[PDB]
Design a protein around this ligand. Structure first.
Ligand SMILES: CCCCCCCC/C=C/CCCCCCCCOC(=O)[C@H](O)CO
Ligand SMILES: CCCCCCCC/C=C\CCCCCCCCOC(=O)[C@H](O)CO
Ligand SMILES: CCCCCCCC/C=C\CCCCCCCCOC(=O)[C@H](O)CO
Ligand SMILES: CCCCCCCC/C=C\CCCCCCCCOC(=O)[C@H](O)CO
Ligand SMILES: CCCCCCCC/C=C\CCCCCCCCOC(=O)[C@H](O)CO
Ligand SMILES: CCCCCCCC/C=C\CCCCCCCCOC(=O)[C@H](O)CO
Ligand SMILES: CCCCCCCC/C=C\CCCCCCCCOC(=O)[C@H](O)CO
Ligand SMILES: *C/C=C(C)/C=C/C=C(C)/C=C/C1=C(C)CCCC1(C)C
Length: 229
């Protein structure tokens, strides 16, 4: 039954990508890169979901678990881009914040890639230590987001600060759910079926990408505030 959720994920990301590509044509000036980044987030996710939906995004591991690894290839590209969207909202001049941005992105890539490594690992003890390492990097991401970007965004215009805060809270809430789903799904304890796991990630993905992107790209006042500068 997981095929159903993968096809819904595909169509949802596809429709989001097409809509975001459309909104670009009326983007406030100097803001078109937001629309491009956000349509790439959903577009990459659409490709991953199509791959998994057509049966090419998973392998049966030596322990017999079916492992949807294409999921993580999506994530390793799109979660940095989501953070990038948040950085470009919050930071008035990102060219002077290379060290922070590279640090945030590197932590995020370590999180995803160590989670993929944990998921692919059959040895139960190696899987646990790798999940902890991944969660450690995740805490790094949340910390940089909360300690640095919330402060930066408070110096932006009221509309920019408002959409940043909305997207950042949305991000923190949704991203915390992903390790929980991992832990109850087949990669972790197997408390729920693979079909349930795939459904949960599909709902999270659509909210964290299409919901995120709808809120971002509809905030035309905030965008124009940034574009005008
Ligand atoms: C300036 C940057 C500094 C960064 C410092 C990082 C320090 C943290 C690293 C710790 C090493 C952890 C090794 C054990 C986990 C890997 C098991 C792997 O297990 C497996 O792959 C399977 O169990 C094999 O069957
Ligand atoms: C919005 C970002 C992009 C998201 C993806 C949307 C575009 C999807 C494009 C094509 C779908 C059909 C693919 C056919 C491939 C044929 C290769 C060879 O095929 C075959 O071998 C035959 O199936 C025979 O079995
Ligand atoms: C897969 C782990 C990749 C880690 C990559 C490094 C992330 C943290 C680096 C930040 C750059 C700091 C400034 C360096 C300037 C001097 C070299 C020019
Ligand atoms: C189930 C009740 C006990 C708590 C389990 C919660 C978290 C465990 C996290 C450690 C890593 C697990 C790797 C599989
Ligand atoms: C597997 C579940 C993972 C849940 C992650 C929750 C992380 C919360 C931990 C530490 C808070 C980090 C932010 C501190 C901000 C200080 C300014
Ligand atoms: C079961 C998943 C629960 C997720 C809970 C997320 C709690 C944190 C929410 C918003 C944090 C806002 C921080 C502002 C500085
Ligand atoms: C989105 C938030 C969580 C929705 C609840 C999932 C229910 C699965 C319900 O799953 C079911 O009904 C299956 O039969 C369980 O095997
Ligand atoms: C569009 C996709 C998104 C926003 C995916 C987010 C994924 C995560 C925040 C993943 C977190 C993980 C851990 C913190 C521990 C190991 C397992 C992961 C990779 C699910």
């Amino acid at each position: 039954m997981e095929a159903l959720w993968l096809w819904i994920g595909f169509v949802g990301m596809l429709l989001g990508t097409l809509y975001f590509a459309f909104l670009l044509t009326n983007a406030p000036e100097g803001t078109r890169y937001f629309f491009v980044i956000t349509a790439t987030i959903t577009g990459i996710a659409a490709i991953a979901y199509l791959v998994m939906a057509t049966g090419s995004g998973s392998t049966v591991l030596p322990d017999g678990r079916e492992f949807y690894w294409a999921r993580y290839i999506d994530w390793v590209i799109t979660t940095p881009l989501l953070l990038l969207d948040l950085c470009l909202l919050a930071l008035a001049d990102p060219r002077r914040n290379v060290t922070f941005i590279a640090s945030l992105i590197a932590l995020d890539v370590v999180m995803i890639l160590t989670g993929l490594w944990a998921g692919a690992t059959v040895n139960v003890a190696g899987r646990a230590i790798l999940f902890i390492i991944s969660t450690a990097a995740f805490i790094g991401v949340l910390y940089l987001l909360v300690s640095r970007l919330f402060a930066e965004a408070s110096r932006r215009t009221p509309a920019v600060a408002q959409i940043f805060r909305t997207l950042a809270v949305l991000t923190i809430v949704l991203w915390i759910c992903y390790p929980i789903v991992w832990l109850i799904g087949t990669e972790g304890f197997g408390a729920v079926s693979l079909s349930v796991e795939v459904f949960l990630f599909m709902v999270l993905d659509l909210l964290a990408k299409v919901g995120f992107g709808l809120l971002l790209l509809s905030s035309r006042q905030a965008l124009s505030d940034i574009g005008s500068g």
